[PDB]
Design a protein. Structure first.
Lengths: 296, 312, 303, 315
């Protein structure tokens, strides 16, 4: 139903059972994309811990078979692939540095550092909120991700401003906990029950949303309907800010099909995005390319 | 309580439909029509206009001038105006209603005391009939005609929500033997576009339906032609339309797709100019509150409109 | 000297003396905006009163001679020409077995109605202010003429909003007082927040404002504006951010032709600037909001 | 209460020169001097500020003597360099060049170890300061001026805003190359430095048109014009941090169809920070702090309005 129990119990179950459970969770899709990255890292770490391997290439085979299965599980989230290849890169680096046990525990603790990097990514990003948001600002937060919500909260701790909450579809009320967790901080919130944001855009000062993925060209994978906000914002020259962790930075260009069409998720071309905010800092497209070199 | 209260300050100036028994004497027709306006049974400006005109028509023929008075002095102040204001407090009047009313009162004050009652009343009546026939019915027929002739075989037509003129156009074009594809986009908060889709598929028109405006760039290609209807067109050339319209129009414009608006001349407002959606708008009666807020219409700049098709 | 005093002389003063006293007054540039127009009207009325004539043709001759002299006097105000041209039109449409006295008193009272239309143009324009300005709006009023100031004042009475005051040059060292103090206190009294910018260049502040408002000295057939210097930087800056640009002008300031290429360039005066029509989104007049295609028609009405 | 009070809410976050409240701590006299000329606004160019600061720090370094117990790497940055830093920073908010140079300086300091002779550390730092001044500032200025100047040709009309050291030297060089051209100088009526630049150009023999303000801007920036602009810094996203009014000229030129060329040393390039609006990184005028009369020193010019950037880097 949820899986704090699974993370605690991940060690207890046979590796395969855990993998199947992870796949089921992915199919359900309940797990947060941000959370999704953490699960992949952890699952692969315990793969390394409990898999049958006796040389380095074996590691590469076992984490790629696992990672591939995990990739078929949730095609919608490409962060999985990134996490997998990052783990692989680490193993390769260890091999280059180069006996199974020492390698085992450096790979495992490397994965642990990936894990906690992922977990403090949100607050590290939120540290820039005070700079990006000014007093009296009007912020259109579209389908706010947990990254975005905590961004807005610590923006709220040191600034007084207004948040405009836009969602693609009506509830089958949204963001209640978030919106007066915001009013408590003294931030005004108005929740838009409109699909199509062209009417309200001139009144907001900037647009903020989380990204599920970032491609080489600067393209984004976002929630559906985020692109209408992005485009509407772009025509009125309102700054578009994407909140994304470095692990979500893809070394792949988008598929042509993805570029051509999305829905579940939508694609935003790089010309519609003015700022990428990451844990390492705010990065330009050129700088994005730069950290891609850093990341992989 | 005050429905007006709780509206965010930015949108305070904006009018809202007040649900309303507890009314001044009014003609039964006007009462009915106004209350179908309150329920939002009629939200097309043309349907509202036509209903209002028929109601006012029966109001005119039931009217008998008091003895020792003139019709011209008596009718506008004591009879027509109560109907008008009742209607205004059932729901804020659309431009069509305002314009038609202004014209009607122009004809009432053309009248004089020496004008007998009998010819004045049916002067008003076939003025109403001429207005309905040539500014509404014939106008619709002609717009449908012209727009259907604009369509060519193999075209992909994109429309937003369900608009009476766009529907009549696509249907007419289909019965002319033309073959084309229609993409119907919808407001998930309204959802009439779906039944539009069902109608178009009943006639043999292939339809792709999207319940919302997500993935918009995908389904508004440069090759596509976008047909839109509205409630009115302002003097500066911008289109007053159901919310979400401007998004489709801009998306299409930046795709390179043609954006064609269909509109009757009765809906052109020469007198007023709007530069933003906030100047002339209406709040959703149920979503007045700050926790859940929605505006009924949006403004589409002339910038995003390729052409307008009218009877004229 | 005093505009009002010149008025007294005009009532009891010789026509020629009053003519070139108004001319000296125009060249000094003490007369501002709409008042200039009104003064012209008054003068032209007095012309008709004392203007050496026994048929319509010299009435036209002296009204055109005088009007030519006032037009040449102040090239920066083209409203003068407009007033003159309407006075002429007035004369020739009430030209048609009667004594001149009948014509003179009718032309003169026509000019008085020109005059009072000129005088309540501002309030008529301001009646649309509540519609154009919204609660919580941010309004960049650039170098506000008194037309703009009552627009804002009667906007303030029925709305809560913020005004941002921009001026082209810094206050003169002699004045030792920062500007629009009167406007700013009548605005603060009404509850309107005001910020006065000592900035040249408004690009930094434009994204934050919602709309730009300024008075126009003239409107041409093509939709071009003659404005105070530096208004164009506001207009363009706003245009790039798709901020609505609203020009406040009475119908009398509407010129019936496209601007001369000297005006179009910006060589006139330079105290005034030219704004091409694409940077202006709304023309607000006493009759209402008028837009580009509609302009050609109303210029026909004026003359 | 305080000067900060009375600043409008939208602009609360923006820093302002509070000058000196003067009182001198254990700061170096050169640093003291430079700092109070920063307080006076005698030096308002980021490059002049940087260079003065570098000479001050240079004299701080060569007088510095390690305590016997302490090591130069361990003791100098915490107890010597930092006091200078905060005194200067509290004379006036630091421009990017100074910040960058400081971070580089301390980068070079922490490479140092306890087992390093102090003399070797000191003229390591000193030959670094000299190299920085010679190749980042002086030579850079020369090369930028030359290369930008060859872009100018006979019969050209050049437009510039205010007075910029790089622009002034570029135009002077261009005239000294025997080229004949026209310069239109636009000014901030609140600053008014352009007039002097205009006078200098006349002495140079270059005909010039002076405009005290940005009125009638459309008139004097024709599409044929080439506009040369200088600034204080360039952000990572490519936008120009410049004296107020710059973005206005840049846009006017851009939508006129005129080419916009920015002259800048690489020191001023900030690869870490991105600015999308003038409010993110700006400084308030100490005299115009009040709501009654308000002014911001800088504005942001989007890359949309920049045709090209010319720097010291030739290849």
């Amino acid at each position: 139903p949820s899986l704090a129990t699974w993370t605690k119990s991940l060690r207890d179950q046979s590796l395969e059972a855990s993998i199947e459970s992870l796949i089921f969770l992915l199919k359900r899709r309940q797990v947060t994309g941000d959370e999704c990255a953490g699960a992949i890292a952890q699952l692969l770490r315990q793969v390394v811990a409990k898999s049958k391997w006796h040389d380095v290439d074996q590691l590469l085979y076992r984490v790629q078979t696992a990672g591939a299965r995990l990739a078929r599980a949730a095609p919608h989230e490409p962060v999985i692939g990134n996490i997998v290849r990052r783990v692989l890169g680490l193993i390769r680096d260890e091999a280059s540095e180069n006996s199974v046990h020492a390698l085992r525990s450096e790979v495992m603790d490397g994965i642990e550092e990936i894990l906690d990097e992922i977990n403090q990514a949100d607050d590290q990003i939120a540290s820039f909120a005070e700079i990006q948001i000014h007093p009296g600002d009007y912020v259109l937060a579209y389908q706010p991700s947990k990254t975005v919500e905590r961004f807005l909260v610590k923006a709220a701790s040191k600034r007084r401003f207004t948040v405009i909450l836009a969602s693609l579809n009506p509830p089958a009320q949204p963001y209640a906990a978030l919106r007066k967790k915001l009013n408590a901080a003294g931030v005004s919130t108005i929740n838009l029950a409109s699909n199509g944001l062209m009417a309200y855009i001139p009144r907001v000062n900037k647009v903020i949303f989380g990204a599920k993925a970032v491609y080489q060209n600067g393209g984004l994978l976002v929630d559906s309907g985020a692109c209408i906000a992005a485009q509407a914002a772009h025509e009125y020259l309102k700054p578009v800010i994407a909140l994304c962790g470095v692990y979500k930075f893809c070394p792949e260009d988008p598929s042509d099909e993805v570029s051509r069409g999305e829905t579940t998720t939508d694609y935003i071309p790089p010309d519609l995005v003015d700022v990428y905010l990451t844990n390492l800092g705010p990065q330009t497209r050129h700088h994005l390319g730069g950290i891609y070199a850093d990341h992989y | 309580k005050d429905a007006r209260s709780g509206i965010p300050e930015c949108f305070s100036h904006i009018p809202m439909a007040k649900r309303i028994q507890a009314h001044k004497d009014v003609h039964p027709a006007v009462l009915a029509v106004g209350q179908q306006m309150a329920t939002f049974a009629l939200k097309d400006s043309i349907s509202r206009l036509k209903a209002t005109l028929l109601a006012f028509r029966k109001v005119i023929e039931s009217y008998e001038t008091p003895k020792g008075n003139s019709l011209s002095r008596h009718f506008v102040p004591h009879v027509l105006n109560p109907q008008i204001e009742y209607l205004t407090e059932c729901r804020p009047m659309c431009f069509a209603m305002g314009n038609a009313i202004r014209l009607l009162k122009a004809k009432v004050n053309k009248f004089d005391i020496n004008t007998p009652e009998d010819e004045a009343k049916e002067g008003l009546l076939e003025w109403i009939d001429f207005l309905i026939n040539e500014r509404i019915t014939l106008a619709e027929y002609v717009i449908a005609r012209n727009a259907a002739q604009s369509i060519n075989d193999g075209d992909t037509i994109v429309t937003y929500g369900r608009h009476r003129l766009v529907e009549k156009t696509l249907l007419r074009a289909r019965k002319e033997g033309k073959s084309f594809n229609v993409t119907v986009l919808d407001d998930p908060y309204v959802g009439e576009g779906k039944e539009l889709a069902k109608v178009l598929r009943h006639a043999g028109i292939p339809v792709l339906y999207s319940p919302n405006l997500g993935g918009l760039r995908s389904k508004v290609p440069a090759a596509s032609n976008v047909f839109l209807g509205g409630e009115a067109i302002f003097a500066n050339g911008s289109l007053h339309a159901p919310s979400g319209t401007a998004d489709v129009a801009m998306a299409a414009t930046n795709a390179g797709a043609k954006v064609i608006v269909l509109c009757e001349t009765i809906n052109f407002d020469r007198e007023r100019v709007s530069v933003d959606a906030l100047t002339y708008n209406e709040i959703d009666p149920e979503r007045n509150t700050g926790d859940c807020f929605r505006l009924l219409f949006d403004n589409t700049h002339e910038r995003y409109i390729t052409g307008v098709i009218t009877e004229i």
